[PDB]
């Protein structure tokens, strides 16, 4: 239980429909190379687009991404405590959160409902997670590697994915095509046919 | 080979702010503001994690105060506007007289404020539509999703309308069952 989070602190000073907009952005990142093994934590900060000050778990202290973020860098690294927290990031923040979701995000798996249809064949894979998947066309036990193409991986924001893999070909009277799907939700190579 | 991002932002003058966890591009949960409660982008995560509530707000108010400062560091340099890039597509393949969902893709935009309309033929009707909050991209631009449960009539033509300050005038990206 108990999902945890991170936090930020002030800068130097204080503060106070066509109106000109302003935007602040804070991304606490994380990066996991194969599980709880080597882990890279990132604490970023932005202004509009531009990244100004940063913290790399591998640099052990706040650096600067522009002279525009120069001060905040020196300012935070001047605070003993905080640096001892962010230094522990990977273990308090990353490993932890990851530990909670090692179930319903990392290991979460769902079947790839697969269809097919001319519009040139089409092969529509749907509602599958993760999106790491192989789809290869087959003409009569041979693999057709050319003249193919992919819509690539698509994202629905609901955790399902989707992809359209087209195959441009001219058939004749009694051959058989095939569309083959392997996603690590499947013990077997799910397939579909056309004639 | 994996990412856990907790991205947050404060926006002035609109004074609106967001708090969310992007895991591998799809959202986990975002703490709502008015409601001031945990809201998952998917409920199946409902009883596992259980995130703090006002906890978000603490950050947010911070990010505000950071913005106040970081503004006077630039000599009050405003935001460079960005247009969205819109495409509308069907969840599964569209069949005849089969249930389905339109998904409106607004992408690569900023600041994170948009007005979306689901209308047919020009009929502004919304029956149990759905909208996900802003998802952060690599370029720190923004992503978003409006859904639209619906049925495939060879008659109707459904349309998506997105208003943003990046486009000098409202955008209409259409779709029709073919």
């Amino acid at each position: 239980f108990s999902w945890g989070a991170e936090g930020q602190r002030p800068g130097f000073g204080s503060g106070g429909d066509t109106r000109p907009r302003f935007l602040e952005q804070v991304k606490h990142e994380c990066h996991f190379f194969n599980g709880t093994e080597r882990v890279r934590f990132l604490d970023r900060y932005f202004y509009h687009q531009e990244e100004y000050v940063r913290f790399d778990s591998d640099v052990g202290e706040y650096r600067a991404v522009t002279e525009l973020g120069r001060p905040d860098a020196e300012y935070w690294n001047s605070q003993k405590d905080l640096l001892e927290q962010k230094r522990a990031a990977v273990d308090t923040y990353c490993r932890h959160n990851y530990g909670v979701g090692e179930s319903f995000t990392v290991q979460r798996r769902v079947y790839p409902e697969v269809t097919v249809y001319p519009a040139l064949l089409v092969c529509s894979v749907n509602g599958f997670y993760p999106g790491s998947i192989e789809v290869r066309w087959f003409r009569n036990g041979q693999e057709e590697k050319t003249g193919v193409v992919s819509t690539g991986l698509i994202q629905n924001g609901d955790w399902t994915f989707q992809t359209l893999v087209m195959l441009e070909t001219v058939p004749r009277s009694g051959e058989v095509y095939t569309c083959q799907v392997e996603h690590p939700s499947l013990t077997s190579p799910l397939t579909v046919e056309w004639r | 080979e994996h990412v856990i991002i907790q991205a947050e932002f404060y926006l002035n003058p609109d004074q609106s702010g967001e708090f969310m966890f992007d895991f591998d591009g799809d959202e986990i949960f975002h703490v709502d503001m008015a409601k001031k409660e945990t809201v998952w982008r998917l409920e199946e995560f409902g009883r596992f994690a259980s995130f703090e509530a006002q906890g978000a707000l603490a950050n947010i108010a911070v990010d505000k105060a950071n913005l106040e400062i970081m503004t006077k560091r630039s000599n009050y340099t405003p935001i460079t506007n960005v247009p969205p890039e819109v495409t509308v597509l069907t969840n599964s393949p569209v069949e005849l007289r089969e249930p389905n969902v339109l998904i409106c893709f607004i992408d690569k935009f900023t600041p994170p404020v948009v007005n979306v309309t689901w209308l047919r033929n020009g009929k502004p009707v919304t029956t149990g539509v759905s909208e996900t909050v802003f998802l952060p991209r690599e370029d720190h631009l923004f992503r978003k999703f409006h859904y639209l449960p619906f049925l495939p009539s060879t008659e109707d033509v459904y349309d998506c309308r997105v208003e943003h300050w990046g486009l000098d005038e409202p955008l209409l990206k259409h779709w029709e069952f073919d």
């Epitope: 239980f1 108990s2 999902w3 945890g4 989070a5 991170e6 936090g7 930020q8 602190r9 002030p10 204080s14 405590d81 927290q85 522990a88 308090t92 923040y93 932890h96 530990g99 909670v100 | 001031k36 703090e52 006002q54 906890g55 707000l57 603490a58 950050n59 947010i60 108010a61 911070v62 505000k64 105060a65």
Partner: T-cell receptor
Framework: VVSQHPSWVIAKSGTSVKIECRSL??????MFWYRQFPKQSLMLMAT?????????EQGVEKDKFLINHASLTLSTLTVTSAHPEDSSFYIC????????????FGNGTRLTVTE | AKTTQPNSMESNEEEPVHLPCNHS???????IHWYRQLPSQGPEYVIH???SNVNNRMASLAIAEDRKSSTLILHRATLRDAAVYYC???????????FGTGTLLAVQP
């Protein structure tokens, strides 16, 4: 460091009691208002995130206590409709940010309100 | 209800005093803070740590292997240590500092 003014005070059976809290140096993103009754414990009344709706922990008298938290510094906990049963030890704290930001306290304001 | 402590406890001057704290079970990322209060005045910081062990001036800190229990250590107890010692939890899952029931220590001259 943070100062609580006034440190002592007394008013009528009801009145406006305006208790400030000021962070003399750092910017205060968050404010915690604790009140402590005689030989009891430290109870958490409210939370003021800068320029926001102040969240009152459950079991409070609601609009009875009002937090004006203003910019980064001036923070006004004002209690109107004074009551004898409310005389207590009122302690305020400031924070240099969100989670795991050291919680910086203050003097605290001891108050008796008679009729 | 965050963490539990014994209401009151007695010691002797110059004597080492060990202060028990049991918290239930606490989440993965939360620090354990120990705050104390002079008889009438604001509270004040003492010491904290994730796991393992930690010590500084004014005191030391004993965290159990499973992080189920913690113990505040006072090497040589002076008269000014008489006070209430609160044991709380502050961290990633708790933004708010939730003040416990308390341990009152009276040290005898």
């Amino acid at each position: 460091v943070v100062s609580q003014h006034p440190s002592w005070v007394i008013a009528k059976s009801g009145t406006s009691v305006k208790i400030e809290c000021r962070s003399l140096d750092f910017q205060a993103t968050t404010m915690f208002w604790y009140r402590q009754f005689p030989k009891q414990s430290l109870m958490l009344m409210a939370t003021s995130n800068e320029g926001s709706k102040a969240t009152y922990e459950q079991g409070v008298e609601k609009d009875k206590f009002l937090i004006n938290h203003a910019s980064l510094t001036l923070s006004t906990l004002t209690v109107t409709s004074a009551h004898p049963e409310d005389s207590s030890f009122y302690i305020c704290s400031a924070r240099g940010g969100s989670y795991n930001s050291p919680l910086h306290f203050g003097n605290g304001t001891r108050l008796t309100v008679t009729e | 209800a965050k963490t539990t402590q014994p209401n009151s406890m007695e010691s002797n001057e110059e004597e080492p005093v060990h202060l028990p704290c049991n918290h239930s079970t606490i989440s993965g990322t939360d620090y354990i803070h120990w705050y104390r209060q002079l008889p009438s005045q604001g509270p004040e910081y003492v010491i904290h740590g994730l796991t393992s062990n930690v010590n500084n001036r004014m005191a030391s800190l004993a965290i159990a292997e499973d992080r189920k229990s913690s113990t505040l250590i006072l090497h040589r107890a002076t008269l000014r240590d008489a006070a209430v010692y609160y044991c709380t939890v502050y961290g990633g899952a708790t933004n708010k500092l939730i003040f416990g029931t308390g341990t009152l220590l009276a040290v005898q001259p």
